[PDB]
């Protein structure tokens, strides 16, 4: 009797993959000094 | 030739500094070019 | 250092990738201890003493 909606798994996988890609594409960082 | 002495050297230094700055910017953005280029943050 | 006067700090190479991975790992490790029926809770206190209890 352990059940979950399938939308949970589907949406979690999609969002996790999107976040992983959008962070993995970064190559260099430039941070500007506060005024 | 024989003469035409150049008694001022400041313009050469200005030109070289300009070249250096321009090449620095070009090398800075060189990576992001092409289908296999990456992003900047 | 030297050329590319930007008035700021720039990092390039494996340094930034490792730093990003470490930040993500720390964020995951903060909440890893509250997963599943045997997970426990967390207590949070602000700068004035107000207390929140949650998982």
Residue C42 near residue C34, CB atoms below 8 Å: yes
How many Cβ pairs within 8 Å bridge chains A and B? 19
Half-sphere exposure of A2 (CA within 13 A, CB side): 2
A35 assigned ligand-binding residue: no
Distance of alpha carbon B24 from alpha carbon C20, whole angstroms? 26
Q: Are strands C8-12 and C42-45 parallel, antiparallel or unpaired?
A: unpaired
Structural resolution in Å: 3.0
User: CA B37 → CA A25, B8, B17, B40, C43, distances in Å?
Assistant: 9, 44, 29, 10, 45
Closest CA to B20 of C9, C10, C4: C4
Method used to determine the 3D structure: cryo-EM
User: CA C38 → CA A1, A32, C41, C42, distances in Å?
Assistant: 17, 45, 10, 14
Closest CA to B38 of C3, A25, A10: A25
- C55: tokens are 């998982």
C2-40 burial, b for 16+ CB within 10 Å, e for fewer? eeeeeeeeeeeeeebeeeeeeeeeeeeeeeeeeeeeeee
Phi-psi region of C2 (alpha: psi -120 to 50; beta: other; left: phi over 0): left
Q: E strand or H helix at A24, and its extent? A: helix A6-24
Residues, chain A: 35
Distance of alpha carbon A25 from alpha carbon B40, whole angstroms? 9
C35 touches chain A (CB under 8 A): no
Q: Give the three-state DSSP class for C2.
A: coil
Of B31, B32, B41, the CB nearest to A29: B41
C10 touches chain A (CB under 8 A): yes
Concatenate the DSSP letters of all residues of B1-41 into one string: ---------HHHHHHHHHHHHHHHHHHHHSTT-STT--EE-
Rounded to the nearest 5°, which phi and psi values hold at B32?
-75, 15
User: CA C8 → CA A4, A29, B11, C33, distances in Å?
Assistant: 49, 10, 29, 38
Residue A28 near residue B41, CB atoms below 8 Å: yes
């Amino acid at each position: 009797g352990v059940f979950e909606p399938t939308i949970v798994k589907v949406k979690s996988l999609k969002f996790a993959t999107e976040a992983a890609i959008t962070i993995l594409r970064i190559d260099d960082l430039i941070k500007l000094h506060p005024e | 030739g024989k003469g035409a002495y150049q008694d001022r050297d400041k313009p050469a230094q200005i030109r070289f500094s300009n070249i250096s700055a321009a090449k620095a910017v070009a090398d800075a953005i060189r990576t992001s070019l092409g289908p296999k280029g990456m992003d900047k943050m | 250092e030297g050329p590319l006067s930007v008035f700021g700090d720039r990092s390039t190479g494996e340094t930034i990738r490792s730093q990003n991975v470490m930040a993500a790992a720390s964020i995951a490790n903060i909440v890893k201890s509250s997963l599943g029926p045997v997970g426990l809770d967390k207590m949070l206190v602000d700068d004035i003493g107000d207390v929140t209890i949650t998982n």
